[PDB]
Amino acid sequence: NHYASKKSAAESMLDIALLMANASQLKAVVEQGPSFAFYVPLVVLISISLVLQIGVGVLLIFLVKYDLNNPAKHAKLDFLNNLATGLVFIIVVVNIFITAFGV
Amino acid sequence: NHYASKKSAAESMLDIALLMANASQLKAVVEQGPSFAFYVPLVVLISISLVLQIGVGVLLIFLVKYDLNNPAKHAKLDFLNNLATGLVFIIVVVNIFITAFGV
Amino acid sequence: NHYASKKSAAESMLDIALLMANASQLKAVVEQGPSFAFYVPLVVLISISLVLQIGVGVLLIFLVKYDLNNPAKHAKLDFLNNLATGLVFIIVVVNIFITAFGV
Amino acid sequence: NHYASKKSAAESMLDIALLMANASQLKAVVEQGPSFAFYVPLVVLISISLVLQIGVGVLLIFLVKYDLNNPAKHAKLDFLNNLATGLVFIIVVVNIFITAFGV
Amino acid sequence: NHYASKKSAAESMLDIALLMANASQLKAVVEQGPSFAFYVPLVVLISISLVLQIGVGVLLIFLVKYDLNNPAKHAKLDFLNNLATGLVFIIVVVNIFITAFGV
Amino acid sequence: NHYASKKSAAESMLDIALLMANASQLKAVVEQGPSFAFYVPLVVLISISLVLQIGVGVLLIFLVKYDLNNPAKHAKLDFLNNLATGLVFIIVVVNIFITAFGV
């Protein structure tokens, strides 16, 4: 008898992000790096990775909830799917760079 | 009697980017910074600024050339315009940070 | 009961890239090289290899998802397939160069 | 009374490339750099810049000569124009980096 | 349930090139040569050999995929086959020269 | 009253090549280089440049003389023109490298 949506919202975005493992490691690497010494090339990758994770999450959720809000949008969905897919691919590349602990 | 498009393409994107002044300063700041000493907080801003400049340029050009490619896209144009405008606003904020030569 | 697409997008591009083995080695070679000494001719090959991997991935995904978006595109598909195939062939050549640990 | 096409071909591509000024400077910078000392970050930019100049030139010429070879290609032309424009924009960014004589 | 084409493209060109053994040896010879001493006459042969391998691979793949793209091309196929065959023959001659470890 | 074709053939190819200025300089550079000292990176460019000049000359002359030998070849002409144009563009790039007297 608890018809709230706070729990609904948190689970909805959490399942739409699913970056907990990705971000969690990103926190350790960006924490260990500066702690050990001054290494510039890795923090940049972390900064970009999280930024793109936000952008893709922003785009994915909106069209995931609905696709008939506008009078007609049938082919443009692929373009947004195309754009989001490219962002994920970039995220994959950078995530591979950082886990190597080097450029 | 030179019906090429190389000149057309370069001018088209150059007028669609118009970041020459923005980027040019970004090059000097990212060059002077590391030259003087190890300062981490500024290079990150430069990295993000150029990244967003690319993203907005990518989005702007496609819909600028045409808007009737899909069967119907009349209200979604605002959403893309909304997204691009937000990116520019972020670019403005970071550009203001870096020109201050501090966090 | 999790109708998300984040997992869908990541798997889609990951299976469309399948460069994890290729890139992973690229990270080690580009890390060991500068670590040992200054060797210019190998890093360039790594830089080009990943660049082309991105370009081919960009082209492959778009037409893989659909091929009837435009009013009619039946013969142009081969041209894009021709272009992507050439990029892969170039990627093969450079990948062979770098694994030789020499020019 | 010289109905050859060698002169036609050379002028056609030369006007389609128009990188003589761009490349010519690229030669001096990539020559002075290694001559002075070992500086890695600049040669990579030169290598990428020329590579993209080739790719865009490859794409531009084919569709510039004709656009009705296939049964119908009216909307895909924009996609190729979109792809080529992005490559030029990348070329602009790197060209700006290298002329700064720094990262 | 993985309807991708990255794997398709890589295998397609790899079976269309089948130079892995040829190139692999080319890497060792071009690596050992300069390592031992300054010997000019062999590297040139390696450079030409790989160049022709690219050219023939470029020509072979396009017409291998299809031969009815144009309104009619029945006799010209032999000319392209003639041209590609000559390139392979040249590749054979140079490959024989280099394996002799001499001019 | 001299209905020979030796003079016709020599002029025909000479006007179809028009590399006398290009080759003539190529001879001096490839002569001065080894004379001064052992410099590997320039002779390779000369070797490739002349090779491509031959290939383009081979292709250009055949289709220049006639284009109706086969039952029908109307669209394939562009492909050959496309291939030859690319070779010239490569020749331009290398010719620019060598005239710089450096890599």
Author numbering:
A (entry chain F), B (entry chain C), C (entry chain E), D (entry chain B), E (entry chain D), F (entry chain A): 39 to 141
Per the authors:
Plasma membrane rupture was long thought to be driven by osmotic pressure, but it has recently been shown to be in many cases an active process, mediated by the protein ninjurin-18 (NINJ1). NINJ1 is a 16-kDa plasma membrane protein that is evolutionarily conserved and found in all higher eukaryotes. Our data thus suggest that, during lytic cell death, the extracellular α-helices of NINJ1 insert into the plasma membrane to polymerize NINJ1 monomers into amphipathic filaments that rupture the plasma membrane. The membrane protein NINJ1 is therefore an interactive component of the eukaryotic cell membrane that functions as an in-built breaking point in response to activation of cell death.
To characterize polymeric NINJ1 at the atomic level, we expressed full-length, wild-type hNINJ1 (residues 1–152) recombinantly in Escherichia coli and extracted it from the bacterial membrane with the detergent n-dodecyl-β-d-maltopyranoside (DDM). The filaments were linear stacks of subunits, with an interval of 20.95 Å and a slight rotation of –1.05° per subunit. The cryo-EM map had a resolution of 3.8 Å, enabling us to build a molecular model of filamentous hNINJ1. The next 103 residues (residues 39–141) were well represented in the maps and could be modelled unambiguously as four α-helices α1–α4. Notably, the experimental density comprised two identical hNINJ1 filaments, which were packed together in an antiparallel arrangement. The hNINJ1 filament is organized by stacking of adjacent protomers in a fence-like manner. The two antiparallel helices α3 and α4 (residues 79–103 and 114–138, respectively) form the core of the filament. The two N-terminal helices α1 and α2 (residues 44–55 and 58–74, respectively) are separated by a distinct kink at L56. α2 thus adopts a parallel orientation with respect to α3 and α4, whereas α1 protrudes at a nearly 90° angle from the helical bundle and connects to the adjacent protomer via an extensive polymerization interface. The intermolecular contacts include multiple side chain interactions between helix α1 of one protomer and helices α1, α3 and α4 of the neighbouring protomer, of which a salt bridge between the highly conserved residues K45 and D53 is the most prominent. When analysing the surface hydrophobicity of the NINJ1 filament, we observed that one face of the filament is hydrophilic whereas the other face is hydrophobic. These properties directly explain how two hNINJ1 filaments have stacked via their hydrophobic faces to result in the soluble double filament resolved by cryo-EM.
